[PDB]
Amino acid sequence: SGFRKMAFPSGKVEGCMVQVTCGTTTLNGLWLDDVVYCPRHVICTSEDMLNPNYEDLLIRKSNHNFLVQAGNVQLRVIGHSMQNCVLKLKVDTANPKTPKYKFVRIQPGQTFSVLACYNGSPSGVYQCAMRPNFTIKGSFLNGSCGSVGFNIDYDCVSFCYMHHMELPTGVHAGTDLEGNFYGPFVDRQTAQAAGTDTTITVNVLAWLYAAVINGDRWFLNRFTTTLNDFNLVAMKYNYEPLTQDHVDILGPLSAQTGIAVLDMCASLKELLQNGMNGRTILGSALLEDEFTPFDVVRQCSGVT
């Protein structure tokens, strides 16, 4: 019992972190096999970041200009290429600590762990959700670029995110491992509109199930609702419209607890309409949306 905002164990990802230096800019790189992946903005100076011409800036760079260090070892760079907003530096040594891994593009509403790094060194790990608007509310300072987001299925690391930018709003933006930004963002120092965000409804419901499993039950009521009725409330409160695909994914939680999904929806409706009345659910005074139904099941069963 007990429910925590748990991150995946970061060990497998720590073994992949390197420092990449180009000119006077230093950030983090991900060394998998004989390739080091890092944000392409490692090639820019302050005078360039307003609107960098990345193709031109990269042409002034040679393999020997990318200094790659894995703590005590220097990696020999034998190739460089830009793919979207990432640089792929081919090195002459395959990382001995390369885990089994996949590069995956996650969907908005999904969660992952972030290993925050500075100068190739891991500083901490936290769990977060990809917002429906494709931003993440992380904890990143200057130098944290190149830090990655991931999920782990037993022995396989699915890398889903690489940090590139802090928007003027203090929210964060980044790419998948092919360098495609999540959301409308570009790697330029310009104010950029993040879409209207919504709360991840299926996640809040998943968390309400985690609350019931773990003893917090005060929010359960004598009511039920329909997807249509619930979706009118979700609309008023800027929540994602709930679909049958969301109800289906909550099936295991609904089955374990015996609380029908639409009955939990009626508890959620009442909390949106009345608030918490100064009470808490799993140590939180608001409706948490950073746990997917998969994360709830995994945490509640003891999956390693």
Residue (9 or 241) nearer to a copy of itself, CB? 9
Selected from 140, 182, 239, 291, the binder of ligand L4U by CB under 6 A is: 140
- Separation between Cα atoms, residue 117 and residue 146, nearest integer Å: 8
Calculated CA dihedral for residues 136, 85, 20, 26, nearest 10 degrees: -70
Residue 260 near ligand L4U by CB under 6 A: no
Residue 232 near a copy of itself by CB under 8 A: no
What backbone phi and psi angles, to 5 degrees, belong to 49?
-65, -10
Selected from 84, 123, 192, 256, the binder of a copy of itself by CB under 8 A is: 123
Selected from 41, 88, 164, 172, the binder of a copy of itself by CB under 8 A is: 172
Residue (101 or 118) nearer to ligand L4U, CB? 118
Q: Which two tokens stand for residue 270?
A: 């009442």
38: nearest Cα among 198, 147, 149, 186: 147
Residue 50 near ligand L4U by CB under 6 A: no
Residue 96 near a copy of itself by CB under 8 A: no
* Alpha carbon 157 to chain centroid, angstroms: 14
Residue 3 near a copy of itself by CB under 8 A: yes
Closest distance of CB 292 from a copy of itself, Å: 14
Give, as ranges, the residues between 144 and 173 that touch ligand L4U (CB under 6 A): 144-145, 164-166
Residue 138 near a copy of itself by CB under 8 A: yes
Contact (CB, 8 A) for 203 and 289 = yes
Q: Which residues, in sequence order, are CB contacts of 49 under 8 Å at separation 6+?
A: 41, 188, 189
User: What does 294 interact with, of ligand L4U, a copy of itself, none (CB < 5 to 8 A by kind)?
Assistant: none
Selected from 26, 95, 133, 144, the binder of a copy of itself by CB under 8 A is: 144
Write the Ramachandran bin of 119: left for phi over 0, alpha for psi from -120 to 50, otherwise beta: left
